[PDB]
Amino acid sequence: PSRFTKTRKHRGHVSAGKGRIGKHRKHPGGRGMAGGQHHHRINMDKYHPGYFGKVGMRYFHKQQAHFWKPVLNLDKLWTLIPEDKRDQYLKSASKETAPVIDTLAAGYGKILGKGRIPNVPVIVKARFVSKLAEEKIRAAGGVVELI
Amino acid sequence: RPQVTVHSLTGEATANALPLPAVFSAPIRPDIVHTVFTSVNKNKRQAYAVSE
Amino acid sequence: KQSLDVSSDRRKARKAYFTAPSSQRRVLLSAPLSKELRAQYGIKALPIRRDDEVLVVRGSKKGQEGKISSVYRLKFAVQVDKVTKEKVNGASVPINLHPSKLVITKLHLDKDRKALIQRKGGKLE
């Protein structure tokens, strides 16, 4: 919408909002990140600390598919079971009707232990787990099956 | 439900009667119909330029 | 329009009419037939050829009639006999009439016109 732009509200006023002393010139500091160590040091060190210099070791041909391992907390673990069959498990599953949560089909590598799960055997199938994840699943009365 | 009365081809009510199919009880927001229509109308357009 | 190969473009249609060659200006300069001639043949309108007799239906020259002299294709007009303007000097000049404002009161019948009439579906010659 050109008609809302202040350009339309600027017609008449000599300098078009850019002042009579600054004049609005082409590039009165350079062209993008120019003088970051020179005359834009204060803005770089503030707001962008750590920009300049190297840190850590390089990795040639780093395939992001090796480091997949997306995470599921236990507060969100029970949300994996469909709501059609959920409540039948959450009210008296109890050993031999202990539900089977395959977290890899759900698309998670690791399970982490943030949440409090209800006291139910909840046989979990995960590639990786935390120490506190497998603690809380055994405590609730289930198990972690590695795959 | 007002229970709408059906008309024949030659005007003529005194036919069957249907209920409202439930979309008519929905909110009418001229502000959302405005903004959505505005952008939907721009979809059937052709480009212009001064050649090069 | 449903057929995509035809154009509804005013620019194209204007040029296609004005730069139409002689053979297609034949068909553009068509005239409707009289109530009597349409009852006879059973055909709406034909392309005006040279020596057909017609009646004027519109314009200042409305009501006048006679044989057509010149099918002036190049001017998109047909000049009719007896329908002329006498200049100030006293020399006559034929008035340019469009054939769609005329009506074919009498047909000029040759083998190619009998063929044209039978083709459209006329119940005679």
């Binding site: 962008h48 598919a65 089977v100 395959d102 698309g107 046989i123 787990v129 198990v143 | - | -």
Partner: protein
């Protein structure tokens, strides 16, 4: 020429990009061209599907191996199993991949029954006998869908031993990290001195 306080952006427009901007107005125009192109190919290939029977194949890269997917072509092993020729398969509408080899029984058996189910459902016309008019089923790949094999049940019993699956993974990682160093500390101090000793 530096911000108030804004993220440092990397806008790659220091070449003559304006000379090779490609705007896709042709999207709708190409879409009807592709549909016409499909309709005319189905008129040419009159009673036969547009696509060939693809095999099932488990995706590579451990991120994606959790799901199966329609591969390129069956195999010389699966074709011989199903009971036809790699030549005859290509002609009667089966993709055959000379490259791929079978190291997996569940994938092999899945694809072998997939060839048997395709052979069951098609009715191959004779060369010069008679043409029986069978209205064309367009998408073979839609007729034979890729079923992601469900490898478990709803609910089970806790067949527990209590080995701490975290401690299992942590020991398995240690066995990996010290496999070679322990073979070296077994080649010296354990052996190469016992080899001389009585």
């Amino acid at each position: 020429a530096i911000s108030k306080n804004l993220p440092i952006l990397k806008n790659h427009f220091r070449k003559h990009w304006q000379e090779r901007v490609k705007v896709h107005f042709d999207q709708a125009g190409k879409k009807v061209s592709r549909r016409n192109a499909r309709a005319t190919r189905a008129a040419k290939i009159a009673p036969r599907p547009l696509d060939l029977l693809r095999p099932v194949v488990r995706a590579p890269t451990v991120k994606y191996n959790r799901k199966v997917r329609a591969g390129r072509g069956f195999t010389l092993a699966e074709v011989k199993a199903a009971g036809l020729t790699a030549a005859y398969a290509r002609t009667i509408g089966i993709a055959v991949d000379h490259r791929r080899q079978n190291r997996n029984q569940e994938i092999f058996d899945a694809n072998v029954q997939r060839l048997k189910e395709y052979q069951s459902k098609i009715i191959v016309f004779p060369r010069n006998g008679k043409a029986p008019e069978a209205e064309q089923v367009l998408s073979a790949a839609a007729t034979f869908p890729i079923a992601q094999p469900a490898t478990d049940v709803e609910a089970r019993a806790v067949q527990d031993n209590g080995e701490s699956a975290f401690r299992t993974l942590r020991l398995a990682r240690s066995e990996k990290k010290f496999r070679g160093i322990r073979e070296k500390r077994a080649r010296e101090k354990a052996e190469a001195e016992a080899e001389k000793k009585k």
